[PDB]
C-alpha cells in the first residue's frame, strides 16, 4: 500500500545559492520601460532582502 | 505606404518544422508521471494538424 | 515648416496604451463607469510627440490603461490607480 | 512581490539540481505542427494549451 503513497521523481531540487529572475514587459515596448522594471527590481532585492 | 500587421518576434523550429515551447513543473505533491499523463489529456483536445 | 491644419479638441492616447489586434487595427483598453475593462477599436495613425493622434473611438474623459495590460483580459473587474509609467 | 510590479510580467525561478540537464525545473515539450496549418493557428493552439 505504501509504494503508491510516496511520489516518484528523478533527483531532489537542491540549494545552489543561485536564483534567476526573468523580466518581461508587455512587449512592443522600448528599453526605457524594461530598464525601469529592472532598476526597481534591483532596488527591492538590495534594500529589502539584503 | 505603411500598414501595421501582426507577427511573433521569436520564431522556433524543431526537427525541421515550426514549433512553440511549453515549460512548466508538476504539483508540489504529485509525481512526474502524473504531469506526463495530464499533458497527455491536454494534447488530446488540440486541433488536428499539430 | 509650413503648417497643414489645426485640429480642435484633440485627444492623445500615449504609446503604452495603444496596440494592435490580430487584423492590424489599433486598439486601447478602457475602463467603464461600472469599473470593468473592455476592448475598443480606435483609429490612430499619426505620432505626435510620444502620443498617438487618435481621431476616432476614444472620447473625452475616459480612462485608458497603460500598464497591467497583460495581467488583464477584456471583461473583468479592475481597480484604477494613477499610472506612474507615463511621462 | 513581483506580482506587485503592475508594469511587467516578472517570473522568478530557481535552477535545477543538475545544471547540465537544463535551465529550470520540471518538464518541457515542443508543441509543433506537421501539415503547415499556419503560424497564427499554431499560436492559437499554444494559447489553448496554456
Nearest chain A alpha carbon to C68: A26
How many CB atoms are closer than 10 A to CB C32? 13
Contact assignment for C69 to A26 by CB distance below 8 Å:
yes
Nearest chain D alpha carbon to C65: D7
Q: Burial letters for D28-39: b for 16+ Cβ neighbours within 10 Å, e otherwise? A: eeebbbeeebee
B3 to chain C, any CB pair closer than 8 A? The answer is yes
φ/ψ (deg, to 5) at A43: -65, -40
How many CB atoms are closer than 10 A to CB B14? 13
DSSP assigned state of D36: -
φ/ψ (deg, to 5) at B21: -90, 160
Contact assignment for C19 to A33 by CB distance below 8 Å:
no
**Resolution to 1 decimal, in Å?**
3.6
φ/ψ (deg, to 5) at A27: -75, 175
Q: Does the CA dihedral C83-A20-D44-B37 come out positive or negative? A: negative
Contact assignment for D32 to B17 by CB distance below 8 Å:
yes
Question: Which of D29, D41, D13, D50 lies closest to B21, judged by CA?
Answer: D29
Distance from the A49 Cα atom to the nearest Cα atom in chain C, whole angstroms: 24
Helix then strand then coil, % of chain A, to nearest 5: 40, 10, 50
All 3 cell numbers of residue A42?
A: 534591483
Q: Does the CA dihedral C79-D7-C19-A32 come out positive or negative? A: positive
B18 to chain D, any CB pair closer than 8 A? The answer is yes
Number of residues assigned to chain B = 50
Smallest Cβ–Cβ distance between D24 and the set B23, B39, B49 belongs to B23
Nearest chain C alpha carbon to A35: C85
All 3 cell numbers of residue A46?
A: 538590495
Is residue D8 a contact partner of residue A37, using CB atoms and an 8 Å limit?
Answer: yes
Amino acid at each position: 500500500w505504501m509504494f503508491t503513497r510516496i511520489p516518484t521523481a528523478f533527483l531532489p531540487d537542491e540549494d545552489q545559492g543561485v536564483l534567476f529572475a526573468q523580466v518581461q514587459t508587455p512587449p512592443g515596448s522600448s528599453a526605457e520601460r524594461t530598464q525601469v522594471v529592472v532598476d526597481s527590481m534591483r532596488e527591492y532585492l538590495l534594500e529589502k532582502e539584503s | 505606404t505603411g500598414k501595421w500587421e501582426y507577427g511573433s518576434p521569436k520564431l522556433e523550429r524543431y526537427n525541421g518544422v515550426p514549433a512553440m515551447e511549453i515549460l512548466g513543473e508538476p504539483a508540489p505533491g504529485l509525481s512526474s508521471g502524473d504531469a506526463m499523463a495530464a499533458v497527455e489529456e491536454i494534447v488530446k483536445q488540440l486541433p488536428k494538424g499539430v | 515648416q509650413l503648417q497643414e491644419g489645426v485640429k480642435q479638441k484633440a485627444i492623445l492616447a500615449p504609446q503604452q496604451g495603444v496596440t494592435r489586434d490580430l487584423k492590424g487595427q489599433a486598439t486601447a483598453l478602457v475602463v467603464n463607469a461600472q469599473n470593468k475593462v473592455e476592448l475598443r477599436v480606435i483609429k490612430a495613425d499619426r505620432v505626435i510627440g510620444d502620443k498617438w493622434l487618435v481621431t476616432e473611438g476614444l472620447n473625452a474623459g475616459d480612462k485608458i490603461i497603460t500598464e497591467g495590460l497583460q495581467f488583464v483580459q477584456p471583461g473583468v473587474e479592475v481597480k484604477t490607480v494613477p499610472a506612474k509609467n507615463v511621462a | 512581490h513581483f506580482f506587485s510590479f503592475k508594469d511587467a510580467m516578472v517570473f522568478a525561478f530557481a535552477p535545477p539540481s543538475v545544471l547540465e540537464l537544463g535551465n529550470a525545473t520540471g518538464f518541457d515539450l515542443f508543441l509543433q505542427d506537421q501539415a503547415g496549418v499556419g503560424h497564427e493557428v499554431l499560436l492559437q493552439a499554444r494559447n489553448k494549451f496554456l
